[PDB]
């Protein structure tokens, strides 16, 4: 599919597919038990801090990771073949209204009397989505190349290189690249969309920092994101696979015990419109 | 009405309907008495907090719920006609009332008990929808362990007849409902379902925090087009038009242990509809 | 005059008129004396607080009210029995809130920023802000809605819900009660914490409003002589001036200053300029 | 030159002129000495406060004033020609200098005298104007009782020859002036007059507060068109072009009694002009 | 040539080049050792403060400087010649997700119990990029003309003028000009894009101040910045050299030792589209 030709016409030349991607904040979907850890699903476990300038060992279940799904498209296939082309996406982050629960057991707004309301989710927020015809290309970049990430259960820079991180990993080191090929495995504090690749994926991201920052979110079923490039060509789905990637961090809740923070994430809906494209 | 055809022309082919939806913050419209609870109408009652990690039992009158109304349209009927909602002018009314800083709220100077009465601040939530059938709802909660009352509110357990599961803290497609009753569906549980709502347009925003300044714009000059990408608006099944909304401005805080009360404001809708031939 | 026809052409068929509306924050324009109360003009008097959950009696001079003016345009119709008549149509307005630069005075005697030493700067105006303007061919239609139906507004000196209904406020007045309606027919009388533009009426008026809350919120304002607000509706028709009367309405609250005595707050308002372009329209 | 006719064509019919206007925050450009006061150039001197409700006497060197320049254009003259200002590229230069947090300002850790030197913060005011005559000014003050110096600043009393009146705290049409001198008209007194300025375009914004983060954008790719609704730009009377501005970024705060100094930045103008036939 | 004619057509008449510029916050890329100073790469060293109103001498490694690169373009070139013209650029700041590391050893959010989270990067932010056919023209302007900048290892106003700064250097002094001709050498608190020059460069900048201000950033591979002027002419590359300039400061991290601040910068990606232009 090097040369892109005419749009395919006729019955079933256009298709629409939908999916939701649940957040991957740290606690896995199982155990389902609401006493055995399932109560943290949708959240991270309590963020654990470095014990010195040289001893930073975050728990896997404290690190939000990328969500991803590979969706199978209808079968297609002569020198001239057909590919599915992603034209547009309607995407929405669902559940912001749930943050209006200020009646729980979080750190209260009046700490003097332990009264007021249960402090709502606040702070650093991170929203990225991508739609592509192959896995999202990732570029590694970390706060601290000395961070001692677990070897098992997360894919980190050392997983790829088979070597410890180097100081260049705190800036742009082109050696430290990966592909988003697994859900709930690639930490978002390590792996970023690679602007030097991703020719066949469109991604859109934003970051707002701070500690008590009010979370902001909009949602509507009326907004379409066009995925066509400058030449009018959308992502082309290699082997009829469509890749969806996202992360939607709303901030942290804070407990009444030593200000322990838990990340909060929300699920993202995708509705992708695709059309068949003649290719050579 | 599966196939959408031409616009109907001629006498009475276009109509306009207006409505206001009052907020449903927790205190019901009655009793009307300003000593017996009526003084809280437009507000929630005092937000009560969980007593432990496993004991979260919010009062029904502390939980803002969706406002909704079903409006009856003029009677109509191989080829039939349906009312098509083309546009809406909608406005949230009464933000100027938040300029009352002369009441008995927590004062701005708590050291001396002086200053002004702290105005409404904090988390804000504005959603409206216009559709030809009830708004489709998707459940999602902060805490699947929350012990909502069984009577007086429609919650996930009302629908499933079973306790919430951990998946209800993310997207669980089992936990769905329709917004078919005013003042019954808590907004901390029920969200517009993006997987459905083919015949409704909804528009929402959330701003969080505790002391966040509330922001609101209002004008009679703004029109929201309801037509989809094919130029087709919501089609009104059985000549019923559904309006849905919630408009939370934040909380007021009292001088007694910082008790918070939600504040909501009413929303005006003016919908323009036209007759559409369907087959 | 309800069927709207062609635009009138010829000498004097288009006019521009200008006006400024001074703010009505609580202190009246008189007395002019800078010792006898005039020093508060442009501001409210010190905001007084409720003494209990059931005793909220704000002073009239602590309540900002709507500014309004009715401008009389040149008479058009010698004979109102003519089949086709003319009306003035408001096409557009250039409007501006003047004097935000004055808020850069941080050398006065407000609560200072260094409270240990009574030093630093005089705290500038901050907090809740409210900006609304309207241009119409009849009075702005108002809808009442209050924080507290129990608020004991004075009977004399302000037009409130009770002024209209002749009865005490009801709990529904804390939400939308369609009984509680009025028209903005007098300057400096209708409190902005009570009376809001009525979206169910105002067919012949355009209004534009915004609110930003909080207590120490930085005030924000833009001003330029290059911005035109179009007043034409979706059908290309502006407000039509009934009996050649043009109605201007506004409120422009910038926040409060805070004194050195028990954190007493005074509302600050600024004046608004209007330059309205009008044209003659044939009607029947 | 009342009636505006065709654009003039031919050699030298279009010209571009550039200028920078330095801020006028209170310390004059001289003395240049970095020990005898010149170290405050680009800043005000320390803001001095009223001593009572009736004694507010600010120092001239504590009051930011309008910057202005009159630029002479190329010589021109029934049908005459005038220079017409078509557009302007304008930019506030030096925001990067606010990234100096290594100085001796009030530190972020006042307990230990550690952290960083607090950067410039607070109230911000940006206005620029381009016209064919002086910017028309309308006076309006916080306090008509303020005792401005008679010499060294142009204030309302300078114009009227009488003390300010209470109406000067709102809009008093008597209190008008023209911006005809650089570094003389305080910005807390004198505002662009929207009832005049038919031959000037002005653009302003204000953001208040005490610790507000300053915000600024800059690019050489943005052009401000100066043409009115009829396609006519400011027409330069007697071939004079007037530039006016003020660009306040906030205050720095010292380690002694929180003394505040205003910070201003310079503004660049590149104006495109064309000759216009007039009669 | 200074007269701009038609666009060149035919084989290889258009080219695309890409580059990343790593931030220059104060610590140089070497030593690479994560114990010998390399751990600060991507950051400044600890900001040192003035000791009096007349003694302000910042360490060079505490001052963020401009990043720049000169890229060589394909060789060109009787009377009419050709030049490379920069048409557009896609540019992105990479790695904001790394600021979601709140598990380190920064000053904690709960200083009573030394708990909560590791305070994320916050405060003053500064983002500028430029693309041009010659070095970015710089105009000097400082907070304090008395600042004792080091004479070695950095280019300051005194480097250029061979004289001490004067009071006019705190406003616009037209004598105090330079060109951005070296990477990691021109402090951003001294040197600003010069709006009186730069006829052959486009620059775009923003500043947000404060001390605890939440950092904000957007990133996408779908945004193109057009570099053509009002006449449809992009920067023309003198001697086939393309100049890229930037700085991307995200704020500071604060340590647990006397609130020491370290600047944080992030790398910027550029993808520039160029076309050949006939000139006379
Ligand atoms: C329990 C513990 O100390 N775990 C730490 C672990 O210890 C190992 C082992 O588990 C121990 O048995 C043994 O003594 O020691 C070994 C190690 O030598 O070691 C880990 C590193 O190797 C971690 O340090 C781990 O500590 C946990 O670390 C995570 C991050 O990775 C979190 O920081 C976690 O903090 C939380 C959490 O779980 O997220 C924060 C949260 O806010 C707390 N919730 C509340 C309401 O306070 C919980 C809470 O303290 C947990 C501790 O596990 O207690 C409960 C719970 O409420 O979740 C108590 C429940 O009664 C229990 N349920 C039942 C049916 O018994 C429940 C359940 O065990 C777990 O949820 C299962 O995962 O735990 O802590 C931090 O504790
Ligand atoms: C009164 C009470 O204790 N109610 C709680 C209820 O108790 C039950 C019963 O009412 C008691 O008599 C008996 O002893 O116990 C049973 C049950 O064991 O139990 C409920 C759960 O089943 C709740 O716990 C309930 O407490 C109330 O809960 C709601 C949330 O659901 C609120 O948190 C409420 O707090 C407020 C409120 O009403 O919203 C907060 C508000 O800020 C307070 N207002 C002020 C000005 O302080 C009020 C206030 O404390 C109420 C308490 O009811 O007192 C007034 C009032 O001001 O509203 C006092 C008036 O004098 C009274 N009017 C008259 C004519 O007597 C008025 C009126 O009764 C009610 O408004 C009618 O609903 O109440 O509390 C929290 O109290
Ligand atoms: C003075 C007083 O107590 N007034 C209250 C009023 O009392 C009535 C009557 O005036 C009294 O003589 C008598 O003893 O009692 C009767 C009835 O009880 O009763 C009212 C209710 O019926 C009010 O409670 C009123 O209090 C005033 O209420 C208003 C709101 O409606 C304000 O809150 C006001 O507070 C301010 C104000 O005037 O806005 C706040 C302001 O920040 C203060 N200014 C300063 C610099 O501190 C002023 C100030 O304290 C006033 C109080 O009147 O004193 C001055 C002034 O500075 O304005 C002092 C001047 O010397 C004086 N001028 C001359 C020439 O003598 C000047 C002048 O009288 C008034 O400005 C004219 O209106 O007053 O208070 C709050 O006081
Ligand atoms: C010094 C003084 O008291 N000045 C006030 C003046 O007093 C007059 C006279 O100077 C006295 O000797 C005599 O006793 O009284 C007469 C008349 O009363 O009276 C004025 C009113 O008429 C003012 O009140 C004046 O006070 C000054 O007012 C301005 C506002 O108009 C400022 O608020 C100023 O405060 C600053 C300032 O200069 O901006 C604030 C600044 O943050 C301070 N800087 C530092 C580093 O602390 C300075 C500083 O305190 C000044 C005071 O003048 O000291 C230096 C300086 O650092 O600038 C010290 C230097 O050593 C000196 N240079 C040399 C070579 O000796 C330098 C220099 O004199 C001046 O800059 C020249 O203008 O002053 O204060 C406030 O002081
Ligand atoms: C160490 C010192 O005092 N340096 C100052 C310097 O002293 C001179 C000379 O270099 C010294 O060796 C000798 O003892 O004394 C002379 C004369 O006094 O003089 C300079 C002026 O010319 C400076 O004042 C210099 O101070 C340093 O200045 C920079 C800014 O220019 C910074 O402010 C720096 O502070 C930091 C920093 O390095 O950025 C702040 C940071 O937050 C701190 N980090 C931590 C985790 O606390 C570090 C830290 O204190 C450094 C001090 O050098 O210690 C380590 C480190 O953690 O980085 C400790 C490590 O064990 C060590 N590595 C090894 C293998 O031993 C490591 C390494 O030496 C350096 O990083 C290499 O550059 O240093 O300070 C401020 O100290």
Numbering used by the authors:
A (entry chain B), E (entry chain A): 33 to 109, 114 to 316
B (entry chain C), D (entry chain E): 33 to 109, 115 to 316
C (entry chain D): 33 to 316
Q: What does the article say, verbatim?
A:
Murine Polyomavirus (MuPyV) is a double-stranded DNA virus that can induce tumors in newborn animals. Viral attachment is mediated by the major capsid protein, VP1, which forms pentameric capsomers that assemble into the T = 7d icosahedral capsid of the virus. Sialylated oligosaccharide receptors are engaged in a shallow groove on top of VP1 formed by loop structures on the protein surface, similar to other polyomaviruses. The differences among the three strains have been mapped to amino acid variations at two positions, 91 and 296, within the receptor-binding region of VP1.
The laboratory-derived RA strain shows limited spread and induces few tumors of strictly mesenchymal origin after a long latency period, while the naturally occurring PTA strain has disseminated infection and causes multiple tumors of epithelial and mesenchymal origin within a short time. While RA bears a glycine residue at position 91, this residue is replaced with a glutamate in both PTA and LID. By solving the crystal structures of RA and LID VP1 complexed with GT1a using the identical strategy used for the PTA-GT1a complex, we found that the overall binding mode of GT1a is very similar across the three strains, with a conserved binding mode of the [α-2,8]-linked Neu5Acb. Although the replacement of glutamate with glycine at position 91 leads to a contact area decrease of 33 Å2 in RA, the orientation of GT1a in this strain is not altered (compare Fig 5B and 5C). Due to these steric constraints, the GT1a complexes feature well-defined electron density not only for the binding epitope, but also for the non-binding, branching NeuNAcd in its preferred solution conformation, which brings this moiety to about 5 Å near the end of the long arm and gives the glycan the characteristic, horseshoe-like topology that is observable in all complex structures. The GT1a glycan exhibits the strongest binding in all three VP1 variants compared with DSLNT or GD1a, with no detectable difference between the strains. The stronger overall binding of GT1a can be attributed to the additional [α-2,8]-linked sialic acid present in GT1a (Neu5Acb), which contributes several interactions and an increased buried surface area. These contacts seem to outweigh the differences in van der Waals contacts with the side chains of E91 or V296, at least to the extent discernable in our assay.
